[PDB]
PDB file of C-alpha atoms in Angstrom:
ATOM      1  CA  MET A   1      81.696  63.182  64.864  1.00 27.91           C
ATOM      2  CA  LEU A   2      83.704  60.369  66.073  1.00 26.78           C
ATOM      3  CA  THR A   3      86.409  57.959  64.436  1.00 26.74           C
ATOM      4  CA  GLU A   4      84.643  54.746  63.601  1.00 24.21           C
ATOM      5  CA  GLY A   5      85.934  51.794  65.383  1.00 22.38           C
ATOM      6  CA  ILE A   6      87.763  53.680  68.303  1.00 19.97           C
ATOM      7  CA  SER A   7      86.390  52.128  71.882  1.00 18.75           C
ATOM      8  CA  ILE A   8      87.807  52.940  74.923  1.00 20.61           C
ATOM      9  CA  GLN A   9      86.765  51.372  78.266  1.00 18.22           C
ATOM     10  CA  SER A  10      86.468  53.170  81.621  1.00 17.58           C
ATOM     11  CA  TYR A  11      87.545  51.460  85.047  1.00 19.24           C
ATOM     12  CA  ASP A  12      83.737  50.610  85.689  1.00 23.11           C
ATOM     13  CA  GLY A  13      83.071  49.109  82.589  1.00 23.91           C
ATOM     14  CA  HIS A  14      81.486  51.600  80.315  1.00 22.44           C
ATOM     15  CA  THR A  15      82.659  51.777  76.591  1.00 22.46           C
ATOM     16  CA  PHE A  16      82.923  54.968  74.619  1.00 21.76           C
ATOM     17  CA  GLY A  17      84.252  56.151  71.139  1.00 22.04           C
ATOM     18  CA  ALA A  18      86.414  58.871  70.395  1.00 18.25           C
ATOM     19  CA  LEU A  19      87.579  61.346  67.584  1.00 17.65           C
ATOM     20  CA  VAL A  20      91.538  60.619  67.148  1.00 16.26           C
ATOM     21  CA  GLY A  21      93.956  62.348  64.805  1.00 17.42           C
ATOM     22  CA  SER A  22      97.176  60.304  64.309  1.00 15.34           C
ATOM     23  CA  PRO A  23     100.109  62.889  64.164  1.00 17.71           C
ATOM     24  CA  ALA A  24     101.919  63.768  61.095  1.00 21.99           C
ATOM     25  CA  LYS A  25     105.396  62.096  62.054  1.00 20.23           C
ATOM     26  CA  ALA A  26     105.472  59.418  64.754  1.00 22.20           C
ATOM     27  CA  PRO A  27     105.892  58.893  67.418  1.00 22.46           C
ATOM     28  CA  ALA A  28     104.274  61.642  69.143  1.00 19.15           C
ATOM     29  CA  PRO A  29     102.853  62.956  72.553  1.00 18.16           C
ATOM     30  CA  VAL A  30      98.995  62.505  72.608  1.00 21.23           C
ATOM     31  CA  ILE A  31      96.786  65.027  73.816  1.00 19.94           C
ATOM     32  CA  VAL A  32      93.198  63.904  75.223  1.00 19.81           C
ATOM     33  CA  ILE A  33      90.838  66.600  74.422  1.00 23.44           C
ATOM     34  CA  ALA A  34      88.031  67.185  77.305  1.00 24.77           C
ATOM     35  CA  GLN A  35      84.804  68.644  75.416  1.00 23.01           C
ATOM     36  CA  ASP A  36      82.805  71.564  75.914  1.00 24.35           C
ATOM     37  CA  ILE A  37      78.965  70.962  76.719  1.00 24.12           C
ATOM     38  CA  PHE A  38      78.288  70.427  73.103  1.00 22.90           C
ATOM     39  CA  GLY A  39      79.512  67.155  72.418  1.00 19.38           C
ATOM     40  CA  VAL A  40      82.406  65.897  69.938  1.00 21.06           C
ATOM     41  CA  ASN A  41      81.576  68.550  67.352  1.00 21.88           C
ATOM     42  CA  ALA A  42      83.004  70.799  64.969  1.00 22.81           C
ATOM     43  CA  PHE A  43      85.027  72.800  67.356  1.00 24.80           C
ATOM     44  CA  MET A  44      86.532  69.441  68.671  1.00 25.14           C
ATOM     45  CA  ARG A  45      87.584  68.441  64.881  1.00 23.71           C
ATOM     46  CA  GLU A  46      89.095  72.019  64.716  1.00 25.20           C
ATOM     47  CA  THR A  47      91.124  71.533  67.978  1.00 30.14           C
ATOM     48  CA  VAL A  48      91.859  67.865  66.912  1.00 26.72           C
ATOM     49  CA  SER A  49      93.565  69.574  63.447  1.00 30.83           C
ATOM     50  CA  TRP A  50      94.990  72.431  65.460  1.00 30.38           C
ATOM     51  CA  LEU A  51      97.020  70.162  67.328  1.00 28.00           C
ATOM     52  CA  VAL A  52      98.014  67.636  64.837  1.00 27.57           C
ATOM     53  CA  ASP A  53      99.202  70.552  62.839  1.00 32.33           C
ATOM     54  CA  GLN A  54     101.553  71.292  65.843  1.00 31.09           C
ATOM     55  CA  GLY A  55     103.174  67.917  66.217  1.00 29.76           C
ATOM     56  CA  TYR A  56     100.581  66.022  68.437  1.00 31.66           C
ATOM     57  CA  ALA A  57      98.542  63.484  68.107  1.00 27.63           C
ATOM     58  CA  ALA A  58      94.859  63.811  69.594  1.00 28.89           C
ATOM     59  CA  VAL A  59      92.163  62.039  71.254  1.00 31.80           C
ATOM     60  CA  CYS A  60      88.682  63.633  71.796  1.00 31.50           C
ATOM     61  CA  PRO A  61      86.566  61.075  73.892  1.00 29.38           C
ATOM     62  CA  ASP A  62      82.805  60.765  73.951  1.00 29.99           C
ATOM     63  CA  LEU A  63      82.073  61.923  77.204  1.00 32.81           C
ATOM     64  CA  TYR A  64      78.129  62.081  76.980  1.00 33.20           C
ATOM     65  CA  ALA A  65      78.324  58.403  75.921  1.00 33.24           C
ATOM     66  CA  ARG A  66      76.840  57.503  79.365  1.00 29.93           C
ATOM     67  CA  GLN A  67      73.691  59.588  78.540  1.00 31.33           C
ATOM     68  CA  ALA A  68      73.554  59.817  74.886  1.00 29.38           C
ATOM     69  CA  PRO A  69      76.479  58.434  72.594  1.00 28.10           C
ATOM     70  CA  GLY A  70      77.765  60.588  69.646  1.00 25.13           C
ATOM     71  CA  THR A  71      75.940  63.789  70.857  1.00 25.13           C
ATOM     72  CA  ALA A  72      77.478  66.623  68.583  1.00 27.62           C
ATOM     73  CA  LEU A  73      75.544  69.739  68.824  1.00 29.40           C
ATOM     74  CA  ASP A  74      75.580  73.043  66.933  1.00 32.47           C
ATOM     75  CA  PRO A  75      76.083  75.749  69.268  1.00 30.71           C
ATOM     76  CA  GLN A  76      74.527  78.242  66.766  1.00 31.35           C
ATOM     77  CA  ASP A  77      71.353  76.324  66.811  1.00 31.19           C
ATOM     78  CA  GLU A  78      69.081  77.363  69.684  1.00 32.23           C
ATOM     79  CA  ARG A  79      67.448  73.985  70.333  1.00 32.91           C
ATOM     80  CA  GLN A  80      70.726  72.231  70.348  1.00 29.72           C
ATOM     81  CA  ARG A  81      71.965  74.507  72.914  1.00 28.22           C
ATOM     82  CA  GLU A  82      69.277  73.693  75.151  1.00 30.84           C
ATOM     83  CA  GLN A  83      69.945  69.986  74.853  1.00 34.02           C
ATOM     84  CA  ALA A  84      73.469  70.620  75.611  1.00 34.98           C
ATOM     85  CA  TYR A  85      72.648  72.462  78.934  1.00 37.15           C
ATOM     86  CA  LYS A  86      70.262  69.495  79.856  1.00 35.01           C
ATOM     87  CA  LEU A  87      73.167  67.094  79.235  1.00 35.85           C
ATOM     88  CA  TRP A  88      75.381  69.311  81.121  1.00 35.69           C
ATOM     89  CA  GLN A  89      73.003  69.239  84.093  1.00 35.45           C
ATOM     90  CA  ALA A  90      72.658  65.562  84.208  1.00 35.11           C
ATOM     91  CA  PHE A  91      76.458  65.071  83.570  1.00 37.72           C
ATOM     92  CA  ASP A  92      78.441  62.802  86.147  1.00 39.77           C
ATOM     93  CA  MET A  93      81.759  64.670  86.720  1.00 42.59           C
ATOM     94  CA  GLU A  94      83.288  61.702  88.515  1.00 42.93           C
ATOM     95  CA  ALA A  95      82.507  59.455  85.795  1.00 42.87           C
ATOM     96  CA  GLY A  96      83.710  61.873  83.344  1.00 40.84           C
ATOM     97  CA  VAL A  97      87.059  61.960  84.890  1.00 39.29           C
ATOM     98  CA  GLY A  98      86.962  58.234  85.150  1.00 41.88           C
ATOM     99  CA  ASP A  99      86.310  58.360  81.160  1.00 44.77           C
ATOM    100  CA  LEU A 100      89.272  60.897  80.861  1.00 47.02           C
ATOM    101  CA  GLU A 101      91.502  58.625  82.956  1.00 47.33           C
ATOM    102  CA  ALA A 102      91.044  55.684  80.506  1.00 52.57           C
ATOM    103  CA  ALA A 103      91.316  57.832  77.526  1.00 50.20           C
ATOM    104  CA  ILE A 104      94.692  58.954  79.043  1.00 50.43           C
ATOM    105  CA  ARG A 105      95.675  55.284  79.379  1.00 50.62           C
ATOM    106  CA  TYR A 106      94.752  54.647  75.964  1.00 48.46           C
ATOM    107  CA  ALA A 107      96.803  57.613  74.476  1.00 46.76           C
ATOM    108  CA  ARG A 108      99.897  56.094  76.140  1.00 49.04           C
ATOM    109  CA  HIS A 109      99.897  53.196  74.197  1.00 48.90           C
ATOM    110  CA  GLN A 110      98.788  53.943  70.564  1.00 47.04           C
ATOM    111  CA  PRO A 111     101.018  52.902  67.639  1.00 50.02           C
ATOM    112  CA  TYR A 112     101.519  56.778  67.150  1.00 50.23           C
ATOM    113  CA  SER A 113     102.345  57.541  71.188  1.00 50.23           C
ATOM    114  CA  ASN A 114     105.657  58.558  72.533  1.00 50.67           C
ATOM    115  CA  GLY A 115     104.229  57.640  75.981  1.00 53.53           C
ATOM    116  CA  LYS A 116     103.517  61.230  76.961  1.00 57.14           C
ATOM    117  CA  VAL A 117     100.059  62.350  77.161  1.00 58.44           C
ATOM    118  CA  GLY A 118      98.707  66.070  77.804  1.00 59.07           C
ATOM    119  CA  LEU A 119      95.060  66.945  78.593  1.00 60.69           C
ATOM    120  CA  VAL A 120      93.452  70.210  77.097  1.00 62.62           C
ATOM    121  CA  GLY A 121      89.574  71.040  77.968  1.00 64.92           C
ATOM    122  CA  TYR A 122      87.114  73.767  77.186  1.00 66.22           C
ATOM    123  CA  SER A 123      84.363  74.982  79.591  1.00 62.46           C
ATOM    124  CA  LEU A 124      83.085  71.589  81.029  1.00 60.28           C
ATOM    125  CA  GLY A 125      86.323  70.133  79.725  1.00 58.83           C
ATOM    126  CA  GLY A 126      88.337  72.779  81.712  1.00 55.45           C
ATOM    127  CA  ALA A 127      86.752  72.057  85.053  1.00 54.26           C
ATOM    128  CA  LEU A 128      87.430  68.512  84.127  1.00 55.38           C
ATOM    129  CA  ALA A 129      90.913  69.127  83.536  1.00 56.60           C
ATOM    130  CA  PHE A 130      91.583  70.610  87.114  1.00 57.09           C
ATOM    131  CA  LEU A 131      89.949  67.572  88.496  1.00 60.96           C
ATOM    132  CA  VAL A 132      92.165  65.442  86.344  1.00 60.26           C
ATOM    133  CA  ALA A 133      95.188  67.548  87.484  1.00 60.69           C
ATOM    134  CA  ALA A 134      94.379  66.675  91.192  1.00 56.45           C
ATOM    135  CA  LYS A 135      94.179  63.042  90.501  1.00 59.39           C
ATOM    136  CA  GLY A 136      97.521  63.278  88.657  1.00 58.13           C
ATOM    137  CA  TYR A 137      96.813  61.317  85.472  1.00 58.75           C
ATOM    138  CA  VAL A 138      98.528  63.175  82.823  1.00 57.92           C
ATOM    139  CA  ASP A 139     102.023  64.774  82.420  1.00 58.24           C
ATOM    140  CA  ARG A 140     100.536  68.395  81.842  1.00 57.38           C
ATOM    141  CA  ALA A 141      96.883  69.885  82.120  1.00 59.55           C
ATOM    142  CA  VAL A 142      95.439  72.758  80.434  1.00 58.58           C
ATOM    143  CA  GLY A 143      91.933  73.970  80.909  1.00 58.39           C
ATOM    144  CA  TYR A 144      90.206  76.936  79.288  1.00 60.11           C
ATOM    145  CA  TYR A 145      87.334  78.635  81.234  1.00 58.17           C
ATOM    146  CA  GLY A 146      86.538  75.959  83.341  1.00 58.16           C
ATOM    147  CA  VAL A 147      83.277  76.654  85.613  1.00 56.12           C
ATOM    148  CA  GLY A 148      83.217  76.332  89.054  1.00 55.37           C
ATOM    149  CA  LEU A 149      86.766  76.043  89.853  1.00 54.19           C
ATOM    150  CA  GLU A 150      86.048  78.227  93.145  1.00 51.28           C
ATOM    151  CA  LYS A 151      84.175  75.155  94.570  1.00 50.32           C
ATOM    152  CA  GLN A 152      87.429  72.852  94.132  1.00 49.65           C
ATOM    153  CA  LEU A 153      89.885  74.986  95.974  1.00 49.35           C
ATOM    154  CA  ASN A 154      90.807  72.589  98.517  1.00 49.24           C
ATOM    155  CA  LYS A 155      92.160  69.741  95.746  1.00 48.81           C
ATOM    156  CA  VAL A 156      94.945  72.933  95.100  1.00 48.39           C
ATOM    157  CA  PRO A 157      97.599  70.860  97.143  1.00 49.44           C
ATOM    158  CA  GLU A 158      96.624  67.412  95.520  1.00 50.16           C
ATOM    159  CA  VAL A 159      97.974  68.814  92.016  1.00 48.54           C
ATOM    160  CA  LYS A 160     101.661  67.213  91.614  1.00 49.65           C
ATOM    161  CA  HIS A 161     101.947  67.837  87.798  1.00 45.33           C
ATOM    162  CA  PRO A 162     101.675  71.362  86.194  1.00 41.90           C
ATOM    163  CA  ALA A 163      98.320  72.677  84.840  1.00 42.04           C
ATOM    164  CA  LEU A 164      97.633  75.646  83.281  1.00 40.48           C
ATOM    165  CA  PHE A 165      94.216  77.724  82.915  1.00 39.52           C
ATOM    166  CA  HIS A 166      92.967  80.398  80.487  1.00 36.47           C
ATOM    167  CA  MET A 167      90.298  82.611  82.225  1.00 35.88           C
ATOM    168  CA  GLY A 168      88.251  85.434  80.819  1.00 35.08           C
ATOM    169  CA  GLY A 169      87.958  88.529  82.557  1.00 34.19           C
ATOM    170  CA  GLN A 170      84.261  89.086  81.512  1.00 37.08           C
ATOM    171  CA  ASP A 171      83.466  85.626  81.905  1.00 35.50           C
ATOM    172  CA  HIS A 172      80.326  85.620  84.178  1.00 33.55           C
ATOM    173  CA  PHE A 173      80.524  82.307  85.237  1.00 34.14           C
ATOM    174  CA  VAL A 174      83.360  83.690  87.292  1.00 34.49           C
ATOM    175  CA  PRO A 175      82.460  86.726  89.215  1.00 33.52           C
ATOM    176  CA  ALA A 176      85.228  88.817  90.910  1.00 34.73           C
ATOM    177  CA  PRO A 177      84.806  87.262  94.124  1.00 36.17           C
ATOM    178  CA  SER A 178      85.393  83.810  92.468  1.00 38.56           C
ATOM    179  CA  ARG A 179      88.223  85.021  90.754  1.00 38.03           C
ATOM    180  CA  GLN A 180      89.802  86.259  93.897  1.00 34.44           C
ATOM    181  CA  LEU A 181      89.172  82.787  95.326  1.00 31.54           C
ATOM    182  CA  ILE A 182      90.794  81.047  92.252  1.00 27.27           C
ATOM    183  CA  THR A 183      93.774  83.316  91.895  1.00 24.65           C
ATOM    184  CA  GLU A 184      94.808  83.375  95.732  1.00 27.39           C
ATOM    185  CA  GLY A 185      94.169  79.407  96.102  1.00 29.24           C
ATOM    186  CA  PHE A 186      96.115  78.384  92.885  1.00 25.45           C
ATOM    187  CA  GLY A 187      98.573  80.903  93.621  1.00 24.25           C
ATOM    188  CA  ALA A 188      99.602  78.786  96.657  1.00 20.74           C
ATOM    189  CA  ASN A 189     100.946  75.738  94.456  1.00 18.53           C
ATOM    190  CA  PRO A 190     103.390  76.939  91.711  1.00 19.90           C
ATOM    191  CA  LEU A 191     102.714  73.907  89.414  1.00 17.19           C
ATOM    192  CA  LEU A 192      99.333  75.777  88.696  1.00 14.38           C
ATOM    193  CA  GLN A 193      99.254  78.769  86.598  1.00 12.62           C
ATOM    194  CA  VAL A 194      96.153  80.789  85.847  1.00 10.28           C
ATOM    195  CA  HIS A 195      96.190  83.617  83.134  1.00  7.53           C
ATOM    196  CA  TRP A 196      93.380  86.140  83.046  1.00  7.55           C
ATOM    197  CA  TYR A 197      92.505  87.691  79.653  1.00  9.99           C
ATOM    198  CA  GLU A 198      90.761  90.893  80.606  1.00  9.24           C
ATOM    199  CA  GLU A 199      89.016  91.570  77.389  1.00  9.15           C
ATOM    200  CA  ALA A 200      87.518  88.249  76.960  1.00  5.43           C
ATOM    201  CA  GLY A 201      84.495  85.960  78.647  1.00  2.44           C
ATOM    202  CA  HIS A 202      83.454  82.240  78.107  1.00  2.00           C
ATOM    203  CA  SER A 203      84.151  80.469  74.954  1.00  6.84           C
ATOM    204  CA  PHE A 204      86.997  83.186  73.894  1.00  4.53           C
ATOM    205  CA  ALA A 205      89.016  80.745  71.770  1.00  6.90           C
ATOM    206  CA  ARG A 206      86.179  79.290  69.432  1.00  9.04           C
ATOM    207  CA  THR A 207      86.308  81.097  66.478  1.00  9.34           C
ATOM    208  CA  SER A 208      82.509  80.261  65.978  1.00  7.73           C
ATOM    209  CA  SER A 209      81.564  81.939  69.091  1.00  8.63           C
ATOM    210  CA  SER A 210      79.882  85.264  69.780  1.00  9.61           C
ATOM    211  CA  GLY A 211      82.374  85.399  72.461  1.00 12.02           C
ATOM    212  CA  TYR A 212      85.275  85.029  70.522  1.00 15.26           C
ATOM    213  CA  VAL A 213      88.362  87.366  70.883  1.00 13.99           C
ATOM    214  CA  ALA A 214      91.121  86.650  68.657  1.00 16.68           C
ATOM    215  CA  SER A 215      93.876  88.450  70.670  1.00 17.91           C
ATOM    216  CA  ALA A 216      93.166  86.627  73.485  1.00 16.15           C
ATOM    217  CA  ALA A 217      92.740  83.210  72.035  1.00 13.77           C
ATOM    218  CA  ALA A 218      96.024  83.459  70.277  1.00 11.21           C
ATOM    219  CA  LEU A 219      97.815  84.464  73.452  1.00 10.60           C
ATOM    220  CA  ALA A 220      96.155  81.536  75.249  1.00 10.05           C
ATOM    221  CA  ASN A 221      96.910  79.018  72.683  1.00  8.07           C
ATOM    222  CA  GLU A 222     100.305  80.020  72.270  1.00  7.19           C
ATOM    223  CA  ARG A 223     100.588  79.869  75.943  1.00  2.20           C
ATOM    224  CA  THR A 224      99.163  76.125  75.657  1.00  2.78           C
ATOM    225  CA  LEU A 225     101.613  75.148  72.911  1.00  2.73           C
ATOM    226  CA  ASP A 226     104.647  76.419  74.739  1.00  2.00           C
ATOM    227  CA  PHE A 227     103.403  74.593  77.894  1.00  2.00           C
ATOM    228  CA  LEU A 228     102.685  71.478  76.188  1.00  2.00           C
ATOM    229  CA  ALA A 229     106.090  71.560  74.085  1.00  2.00           C
ATOM    230  CA  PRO A 230     108.131  69.683  76.497  1.00  2.00           C
ATOM    231  CA  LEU A 231     105.933  66.575  75.842  1.00  2.00           C
ATOM    232  CA  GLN A 232     107.547  66.299  72.473  1.00  2.00           C
ATOM    233  CA  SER A 233     110.395  64.303  71.945  1.00  2.00           C
TER     234      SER A 233
END
């Protein structure tokens, strides 16, 4: 689901929609939410709700609009999971960073904006959060269980603004040697923080997932909120 009428334009000209949640009290810092591989779906609506309840505004851009605008897939439906994997495999990561950069610019100047912008991404969006952090587009970035971060470690020195990552100790997208690579690599730049949740795997913060772990979700979420709080007026 997207907010009707909302359109954002990327540097290359491509336009896309977004789900927007204005803040309870304005002005407020705006958080761009980078989707998981299921599009802008119920979990995105829940994340927008969560952030608005904590004093933020939120913008979740339709990152699958270069392939299939308006995709919103139910992760409990097997055929829709297959569609999500096919869309993820075809997803252009650099174009996704570009679309997030455009949503970040859009977030800086809405009527409800206080001019500060944070980014929170999950899974696919957690990998995008690290790439956006390396570009320096936002004041603060957060990634939950991004995949493939051990292949992007050369960008660690490029991060010049804070970025926080929550990783599952049982997420097998990140086996032990990849965890060690990330830990050591991210360890070189104090603007990066990575926490490991030993009893959790992928998708541990989505209540709807078979991998939900409430204690890890709660700890990571309060760390996310404490990390974004300086963006507030």
